[PDB]
Design an enzyme around this catalytic site. Structure first.
Site, mmCIF file in Angstrom:
data_model
loop_
_atom_site.group_PDB
_atom_site.id
_atom_site.type_symbol
_atom_site.label_atom_id
_atom_site.label_comp_id
_atom_site.label_asym_id
_atom_site.label_seq_id
_atom_site.Cartn_x
_atom_site.Cartn_y
_atom_site.Cartn_z
ATOM 1 C CE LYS F 30 -0.814 -0.141 5.042
ATOM 2 N NZ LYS F 30 -1.883 0.003 6.067
ATOM 3 N NE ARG F 31 2.505 3.150 -5.558
ATOM 4 C CZ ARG F 31 2.664 3.863 -6.669
ATOM 5 N NH1 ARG F 31 2.787 5.187 -6.612
ATOM 6 N NH2 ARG F 31 2.718 3.242 -7.843
ATOM 7 C CB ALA F 68 1.376 6.592 -1.033
ATOM 8 C CG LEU F 70 -4.321 9.590 6.249
ATOM 9 C CD1 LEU F 70 -4.521 10.626 7.314
ATOM 10 C CD2 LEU F 70 -5.617 9.266 5.547
ATOM 11 N N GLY F 117 1.056 12.985 3.097
ATOM 12 C CA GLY F 117 1.529 12.621 4.426
ATOM 13 C C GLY F 117 2.925 11.993 4.388
ATOM 14 C CD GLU F 120 1.460 16.371 6.149
ATOM 15 O OE1 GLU F 120 0.848 15.283 6.228
ATOM 16 O OE2 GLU F 120 0.909 17.467 6.408
ATOM 17 C CD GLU F 140 -1.978 16.290 0.797
ATOM 18 O OE1 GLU F 140 -1.216 16.615 -0.135
ATOM 19 O OE2 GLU F 140 -1.591 15.689 1.832
ATOM 20 N NE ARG F 143 -6.537 12.607 -3.032
ATOM 21 C CZ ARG F 143 -5.543 11.723 -3.050
ATOM 22 N NH1 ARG F 143 -5.804 10.424 -3.179
ATOM 23 N NH2 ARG F 143 -4.284 12.143 -2.953
ATOM 24 N N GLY F 148 -2.709 17.837 7.122
ATOM 25 C CA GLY F 148 -2.879 18.032 8.560
ATOM 26 C C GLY F 148 -1.813 17.380 9.394
#
Lengths: 245, 245, 245, 250, 250, 250
Positions: F30-31, F68, F70, F117, F120, F140, F143, F148
């Site tokens: 899921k990267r 990738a 969150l 994320g 981040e 994001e 999208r 955050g």
């Protein structure tokens, strides 16, 4: 070499390192002209390195300090930039007092007004007597405080009480003034003697501990508490592990 | 063109430039709906340029202001973003009051609660009478203050007292409230008449001096004292060398 | 899993989510050694996620907390960096208390001194009784406060009163201490029972509302009011539109 | 005017007729390492330069290297306690604060090593001119030493916090155009950095004193504030500077 | 919707069907110099754009030059006192604060001179697109003038405090790729800056209103705070923006 | 010493003999998307690394892509309210604050996608090493999602507020030397980013623990203060670090 030589300040260095610094122009209620401000810059820029352990600041006569020397001011016919520069010198003197690391205890009497309240606010501790009163009266005369009142008096009594004082010229004295935050000590006797009692006790503490108390706390209050937490840990690390400590 | 035209504010401009601004819905204790907040944004965004010299802010009736109009609120069925946007409008109004440069004196009576205390806190001076009481009661009802109480009330009474007020719903009134920092003036008579006395005196001062007092001091309190020192010197330079001064 | 297991804290979780947290070494007036500080870090780092609704913090015995465990300190023969690291752990514990979002009400008795006042200051509310007194006495012993007093006590009573307390060792008690800002509540009876009354009422409020009250307000006080205005609007948006609200 | 150049031992001073004062570190035998006495002379010079009438300063180091940093010989010999060294650092900071916020434009003419405390000194100037021999580093970190003269503040402001952390954590060296592009110096020359610095200084000295004063003090203060509060302060600085009679005269 | 384009004299306004509003300075005869009346119209437009439903703004100047800065003719004639000019500066700041923190994405399409107060106006936009004719400077300093419209705040945030000090102290001019790489503009085109700005604006206008609102107001606020306090505020902005039904819908 | 590597499910941990700990995200399927449980493990690891004796960390993601962002699958399924998501964001911030301010040097070895994320997470490290496959973006926003997890704070500190606003407002992607020069990574390699990160980590681990602790915690704190207050704090950090016996020994 503490009592070196000053025209506008009378100095008395006691054997325990307490230096009494007295404004010496009672005939004009110790109003502060540019030369006096420069001597305050010089004295408070070098006091710590010259070995002064504490300072008792007082005004000769019945009144601590009337503020800005208006005779010099009116006669100088100052432009906005000229006056801005004068204010920077006031701020330099008071920053050296506040952040300099040498405890300063002001022994107040009579009128502590305008720039005089700005000078008193630059001390760490203030002792007032039964004759002492505080005000920023120039506001009603169209004069804005340019010597730190908006910073230090707000830190002492709250921003909204400081705004009230300059906007209305309101006067405070007695217990009401001490309770408001204008002075930590109020005496029924001699403010000079009470200041000396405090100063002598402070001078018996460790030099480094007093240095940190009289410089670090003001700096910590200028940052977010989450960043001051880290700085305070380093100050405690150095102060609390000194051999003398 | 000061009394232009407002639906939710009653205005009375006196010959000396003092403008009375009265919340005009006593039937709902002057609760603040979005339209009233917008009129406060408009009035306080233009008051200085329209020549208003001071403002006496009051609430029609026995109670200054009950806060957020809950009927409008419940009926609007607001999402988090809708309500965040409403709070930004409250903040815009109160920022224009606080930093706008026109002295504002609030004449308080009865309940100064919730958003009503946030509105009162946006004034520079507050005058309370014998019927006045203060609280942030919504906290116990699950409502957080989104109109500046966490900023201004903390600046007025201390962060820990403001936290106590919203966490417990504690009420303050009388001398105890004035002493805590909720109002600089408390009268046994008419808070409106005392506010007018203060306002008339303030309106007789120089426009520029009052402008600086009622905008610069709040800005200086948002910075480190070592940077505010420099800004204050420039404010003093401009204010104290004006021809009128 | 709240009462998990701690050596230096005695825990009592009540059915409504209020957890009493009691320092458990009265024989040394609950002085705080490094192991106790770590348990405070652990407890206050996880309390919110473990479902604790409010905490009543107390010290076993007649005295809340005497501060830094000096026996451990002297014996550890700490270098400046060793002590700086200890102070960072104190700060981590107190930051988790202050900004953690779980209301903390301290039930004070007897001596709340030095690091003990730093611990009490990390609570949101303080309740003092007739035996309670406050001081930062180590200053005269050459010890600087490295557990947040320069931050929180200044936020409680004013920077100049905090400087006075550490510079002179001045003690405050009774109504004078409550009025100064050292505790929001003073009782003629049991401070524990009064703290529990407050805690039970707070625990009946919405979890999210208390979380915001007990974390956001301290953060807003660390920024310019013009930036806190925007953050406060988002906090109000989320808190006031929750289904439960 | 007032005497500007006399009374110093650790700074060579040359005041030109247009008010530009060349301030030169004078111990090439130790790559101009800064001892406490030199720091005190910098405090004195930069605390009084504006009031003495100095219009601009060209800061340089005698010899092939601008400044190698803190005087380690003096440091080692002093066997300083943490508090003794903290006090030394506060003096370095006082000298550099008087340079940065003093209102007198400072242009550093760099050559060779601009390292450790020397990069801290260079960073206290408003403008930096580097030449083809110039290189920059904060090597003390690899030696177990932390920068206590402002590098964490000013070098971060120059190149970014993460590039400053990189320099002290790894001892990474920068030179040439890469160093200029990184933010270590606004000017790079294939010739004499001193001559380029003098060109810049002479032009700056021709501008109005108050305007240069504001440029060389207010901007640093504004960057320490929220932009929403600096907006108000900047309006007052603009009001004073832009209405001075001399400006209208221009 | 609500009327967005009517009632103005100093701004040409063109609202497109997707909510992008082109705002154009309309006095090419004076290189779009900004007088007090134009600043007031910018305050009005940017104080209401979000609530009127504007989705993005493309800001441009009619003619070959974006904006030459403050209207000096008006300035000179007004013979302003320090307080009069401080008040003018506060109005410039109010207009630019409403642009920066207003929540409506602003993309400036630059051409020719982006100088002094014109660079201050350009810096109040979120994005800048420059073309091959574009050049940047803060020349007023050489003329004895200080920037009182935010340059010390926003241009420092764009290119670094020390490069901003350099620009105003020396009058240094930047153009071309060097200007883009310095941080003066995020986009540089060999063609039409207006057309590139419209491409960017149309894409931005297709995103969610609340998401653009947060991007164009919260980030500037976070940068005025300690990172340890901005962390908390950002979590609340993420909570509101990322749980709006429309976002889930995406 | 103390056990550093046991008890985790969402992090692969490998402690080397010199104290460098490789921390590897372990869900390439899921990267390495970050779900709440992984964030909690990062909080635990970085809250204790210093006290456990870890000298440096090389942070990487298993597989071709660093991270990738969150975990959207988890996000979507949770149907989070604004307060639920704000709480998730505070946990991300706690993990990243413990990384940034924890005092243990972190070097991220990047490959492939460093997005949302994931950027981040990468920004919470002190140093970043990118390779030829690495690319950066904050997609994001397009999208309808806001960052955050600190992007508005740390990415702004890395590349400038206006370039960070650009990235989230437009979804702009950076890669290669352009990304390194922008400030997204201090090191770029034509070979293995992991091997370069290990070279850097081994050298850092050879330095003194206290010196690295100060470098990796104090500088970030100083940047959150006015420079005039950070000056005082830095003097105290220099006093403690530079007088430790081990430093004299060097």
């Amino acid at each position: 070499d503490v009592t070196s030589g000053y025209s506008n300040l009378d100095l008395d260095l006691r054997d325990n390192g307490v230096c009494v610094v007295t404004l010496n122009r009672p005939d004009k209620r110790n109003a502060l002209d540019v030369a006096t401000i420069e001597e305050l810059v010089t004295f408070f820029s070098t006091a710590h390195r010259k070995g002064v352990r504490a300072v008792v600041l007082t005004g000769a006569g019945d009144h601590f300090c009337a503020g800005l020397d208006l005779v010099e001011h009116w006669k100088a016919d100052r432009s906005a930039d000229d006056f801005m520069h004068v204010c920077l010198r006031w701020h330099e003197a008071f920053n050296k007092m506040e952040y300099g690391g040498v405890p300063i205890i002001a022994a107040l009497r009579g009128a502590v007004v305008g720039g005089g309240l700005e000078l008193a606010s630059a001390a760490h501790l203030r002792v007032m007597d039964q004759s002492t009163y505080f005000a920023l009266p120039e506001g009603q005369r169209g004069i804005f405080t340019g010597g730190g009142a908006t910073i230090r008096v707000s830190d002492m009594i709250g921003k909204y009480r400081m705004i009230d004082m300059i906007l209305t010229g309101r006067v405070y004295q007695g217990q009401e003034a001490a309770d408001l935050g204008l002075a930590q000590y109020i005496t029924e006797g001699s403010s000079f003697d009470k200041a000396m009692e405090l100063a002598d006790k402070i001078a018996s503490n460790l030099p480094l501990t007093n240095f940190a108390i009289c410089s670090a706390i003001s700096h910590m209050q200028n940052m977010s508490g989450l960043d001051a937490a880290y700085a305070e840990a380093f100050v405690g690390g150095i102060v609390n592990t000194q051999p003398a400590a």
